[PDB]
Design a protein around this ligand. Structure first.
Ligand code: MET
Length: 531
């Protein structure tokens, strides 16, 4: 099937200003989309905001302003933040969008007509902050913001409350066996593997039915009405998950503004998502509820769900009220946007709760970006080594030459597999392993000495170095989008050779190609002092 590669981030609650968790999730989405664009594929990358529900509505009341004005303002902050981060996201969806609401009502009606929605009751615990139903096994004792005894979620530590309401119920219990068949038939569909195992164990134990409506007063009338019953509102999570279907059906003009909702997802060739990027905190919604709704509705299921961990800073909880802030834009103005992105994607794998420190940020910037990648770009482009300012024509290759050439040739196959898992950390590590080998080769060959002693030998060494730098930079371009352009300009790599799988091949840029012009004193990544 040739189709548009469809990658998504979660749509974020607009109860508070955007922060590092949101930036991180949308970054992963952006990187995956960018890599598929360098491969020459059609891509639709989606992000946005989750704007209905009790959580958001009560955050608006706290601030003493209307939900409409509140959500519009905070969604504006998210848009601004993501523009400042310099992503290449194709659309920003808001659940208040009138076309999204039509799609939610459509899906509801499908579920209902399929016989999978009935009027029942939920009597049980609920976390307003997570908008999540919890069993007694998933709560424990704790303290509310008055320091009085209460119950809290074991998952998140937020205050839980007991709910007893006539609700419309979705027959989730009936989808157990189909969900299990799905997980087993597609053993790569949840990443990392231990989270896949977690999902399977939970579904094995049995699934209760799920409340998909609430009484309208509980939500302060800030939600989508249930079709044919204006006393009930659609569960914010059914509403929110539907953004993925809605986005797959929106024609967007070149300004990023939605102009049209198509009738059938096949028209845009996006649905279902090839990758849903999510945090570990929202796995059950995406890996259990969502596919069950899709099965009920007769819609295709997503191919992969990738669930990452949670950031700390200086080995502590990130929080402004606690006195540990981690502002991405502040760190990006200090160290660079591409470099901050590199660090966030290099420092932690999806299976870990990563940790930022200025010390370690500087160690990676200096060690990897400046000393490994940056040093090598400067060397192979300098007037001292590359006296003709061009790609030289190589002479005969030695066995050592070819050992390096083999690593460069193998790199795209390997990086590609890692990007497709997706495991961005391993793709980056694979690229830098090759950068390190190129460096060791350059040290070994000492091209500076060759400029006088063996000009013919220098041609070979310099050519291999340039081509290694080009290939590694190409595979890093999803991670370092701005810096890869600077590097390609320095190398004088023609535009046409900066994307497409044709250019993953060793030898794509011909000898005789002229380097770009030098700028006196320019440097790609500048080292920072240990502070
Ligand atoms: C359909 S993804 C919804 C995610 C939810 N709004 C959150 O911030 O956790």
């Amino acid at each position: 099937v040739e189709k548009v590669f469809f990658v998504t981030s979660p749509i974020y609650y607009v109860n508070a200003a955007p922060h590092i968790g949101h930036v991180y999730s949308t970054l992963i989405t952006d990187v995956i989309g960018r890599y598929h664009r360098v491969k020459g594929e059609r891509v639709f990358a989606l992000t946005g905001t989750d704007e209905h529900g009790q959580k958001v509505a009560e955050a608006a009341k706290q601030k003493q302003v209307s939900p409409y004005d509140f959500t519009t303002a905070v969604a504006g902050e998210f848009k601004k933040c993501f523009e400042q981060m310099d992503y290449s996201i194709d659309y920003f969806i808001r659940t208040t969008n009138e076309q999204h609401k039509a799609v939610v009502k459509e899906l509801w009606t499908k579920l209902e007509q399929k016989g999978d929605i009935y009027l029942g009751r939920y009597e049980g615990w609920y976390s307003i902050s997570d908008e999540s139903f919890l069993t007694p096994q998933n709560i424990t004792d704790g303290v509310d913001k008055d320091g009085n005894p209460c119950k809290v979620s074991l998952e998140s530590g937020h205050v839980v409350t007991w709910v007893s309401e006539e609700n419309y119920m979705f027959r989730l219990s009936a989808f157990r066996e189909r969900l299990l068949e799905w997980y087993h038939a597609n053993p790569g569909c949840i990443v990392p593997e231990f989270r896949r195992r977690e999902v399977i164990r939970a579904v094995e134990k049995g699934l209760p039915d799920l409340s998909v409506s609430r009484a309208r007063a509980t939500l302060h009338n800030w939600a989508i009405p249930v079709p044919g019953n204006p006393d009930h509102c659609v569960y914010v999570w059914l509403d929110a998950l539907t953004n993925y279907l809605t986005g797959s059906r929106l024609r967007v003009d070149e300004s990023g503004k939605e102009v049209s909702l198509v009738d059938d997802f096949n028209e845009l060739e996006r649905f279902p998502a090839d990758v849903h990027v999510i945090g570990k905190d929202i796995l059950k919604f995406h890996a259990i509820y969502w596919p069950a709704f899709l099965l009920s509705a007769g819609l295709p299921l997503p191919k992969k769900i990738v669930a990452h961990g949670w950031w700390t800073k200086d080995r502590k909880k990130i929080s402004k009220s606690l006195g540990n802030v981690f502002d991405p834009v502040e760190k990006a103005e200090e160290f660079g946007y591409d470099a901050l992105k590199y660090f966030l994607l290099r420092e932690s794998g999806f299976s870990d709760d990563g940790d930022y420190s200025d010390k370690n940020m500087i160690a990676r910037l200096n060690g990897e970006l400046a000393d490994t990648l940056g040093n090598l770009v400067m060397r192979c482009t300098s007037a001292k080594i590359n006296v003709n300012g061009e790609w030289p024509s190589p002479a005969a290759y030695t066995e050592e030459d070819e050992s390096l050439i083999q690593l460069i040739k193998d790199l795209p196959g390997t990086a590609d597999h890692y990007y497709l898992i997706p495991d961005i950390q391993k793709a980056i590590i694979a690229v830098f392993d090759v950068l390190r080998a190129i460096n060791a080769y350059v040290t070994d060959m000492a091209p500076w000495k060759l400029v006088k002693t063996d000009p013919e030998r220098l041609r070979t060494v310099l050519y291999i170095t340039l081509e290694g730098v080009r290939v590694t930079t190409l595979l890093l371009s999803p991670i370092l989008p701005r810096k890869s352009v600077v590097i390609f300009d320095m190398l004088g790599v023609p535009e046409v050779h900066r994307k497409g799988i044709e250019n993953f091949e060793f030898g794509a840029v011909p000898p005789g190609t002229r380097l770009g012009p030098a700028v006196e004193g320019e440097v790609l990544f500048s080292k920072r002092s240990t502070e």
